[PDB]
Amino acid sequence: ILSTASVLAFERKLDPSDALMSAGAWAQRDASQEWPAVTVREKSVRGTISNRLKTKDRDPAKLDASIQSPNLQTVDVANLPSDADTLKVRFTLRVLGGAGTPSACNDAAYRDKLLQTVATYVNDQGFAELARRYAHNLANARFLWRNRVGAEAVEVRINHIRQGEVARAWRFDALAIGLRDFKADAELDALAELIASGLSGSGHVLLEVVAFARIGDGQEVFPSQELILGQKSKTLYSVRDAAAIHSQKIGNALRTIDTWYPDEDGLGPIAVEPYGSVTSQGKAYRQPKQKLDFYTLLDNWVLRDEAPAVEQQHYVIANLIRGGVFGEA
Template identity: 65%
Template sequence: MTEEQTMTSKDTTLKTASVLAFERKLNPSDALFFSGDWHQRDEANAWVPVALREKSIRGTISNRLKAKDQDPGKLDAAIESPNLQTVDVATLPADADTLKVIFSLRVLGGTGRPSACNNANYQAKLLRTVQDYAETQGFSELARRYAYNLANGRFLWRNRIGAEEIEVRIQHLVQGRVATAWSFPSLTLSLRDFEVPDALQADLQAVADLIADGLAGTTHVLLQVTAFVRVGAGQEVYPSQELILDKGNSKKSRTLYGVKGIAGMHSQKLGNALRTIDTWHPVASELGPIAVEPYGSVTTLGKACRRPTEKCDFYNLLDGWLLKDKVPSLDDQHFVIATLIRGGVFGDAGKD
């Protein structure tokens, strides 16, 4: 082979685009919190917004002390100094026993089509690969898991813990009107797996089929999701907590998220719950489902479940699939496509 042929061969070798970005295909709105009575779930006018309010509290020293501070005299002095805090709280009124959480979810088509890509050959190969997946597997398995996480109320996060009853209602909106509606008793659906009771199979499959059609781009899908959580009159509820970057200017030790004074939950937190479908990672038997992330990040545990050294992270799987024609296992294919649905910036600009 001549030098010119060798250079031509190298030039035609497929490489990852240095600019590669995908828009997320599951777009939840922020969720808003309302309060009311469990037996008035069908009465729209019976629900009032959950307001945020401040509370000033006097805490005690409870943090782990350094060795030099464990002297009894120093400890007594520290305890005598009150730990004063101002925090945001959100509670149900004394005459309301149920939290109502409502948000909308838009499902977009065009899975696998980058919003930005500076390598035409790479984009063409990517689109062919995703198209092959869509034709052979479809989006049914991923859609079923997304639908399951709507039905089981995973998006409620801490509000789900200890609830006496939870009902999730899902409505398909067409031109602003309810075309179809489903209702699920969420506590009958586990957070550890995706097994569906026989009585709920048909309804859950109907929601999954709708989401799959939306991901495939064959229909416009807008869902309205409403959860009713019976936690008890006057009980505290848990909106999102704001991240205060400039803590030096903050007068509160905890700031909760609100929309025009109404307690709410960030769309990012809802999205994280919806994509908690990854049971294909190496430690699934121990942790159960985790959110779809390129490295399987679980921030609450400070752990990455998909390490590059084990070749099971998104980048190794995607590069093997596209650049080396090494088709991943079906489970890993689901993970790769779910990461594309998640969206993000995945270019190779920083690679030497």
């Protein structure tokens, strides 16, 4: 029967580090060192009643009463230095490898079957497709959620550090590269090959990504808001008195490769997550009712050895690469 092990875990791969931020002049972009970080600050904000009230209270007096006593609230905002028109973001990326290698498995038969299926898939076709998809996300600024929107010029520089020095540099353009379309390029192919090798375990791979986006003088950046609990209801993530973006928040966008979602109605690339859940869209594609579900596909391809379509196999390999907890009680 080879029942799935009640306890299954897969260590995540492609785990990047924190992303520091700084400001500077687009001209000095060639020389970007010693730039002061953006420090978070607090500013008083006088709110109002913008919430949608129910139909129970329609008396106009109640509304005027609320305006008498305003709602005082404190928030945190981060703005570029007095004289700075370009924002800089620096984050590293590592490739561990052994995606299919399970971290912990209760039954040996299941682990052996999984390793066999993974080796078979790799032999039939390599991870070059996933590596190429990840290369586009790393090249473009898709990792940014709101900083990219409304940008004049975005320039990404992906370096390669092997022994601690700059081995091979790469420079791309996020704006020129299509957001919803993937195009082939010599540099993209080289990067995809390097990522595939690292994942296969041919050697250590470290890539330092640095992006420069033109926003404007004195503009306000949108860092990752922290969790709270005039009481401050908005806390911006800051490390070493410097603004930054969460590691998981970056790794989530970076893995927005999956584009075979059943909806196929203009949504475009969707982050690889079980059940195709989307917070912004509020809809979870690839529901369990359909055979395209990740759990159903893996269970079938393991117990019945039913190899699904190349698209489903790619999605399943992406999920295994991302890692997680599977099985049941």
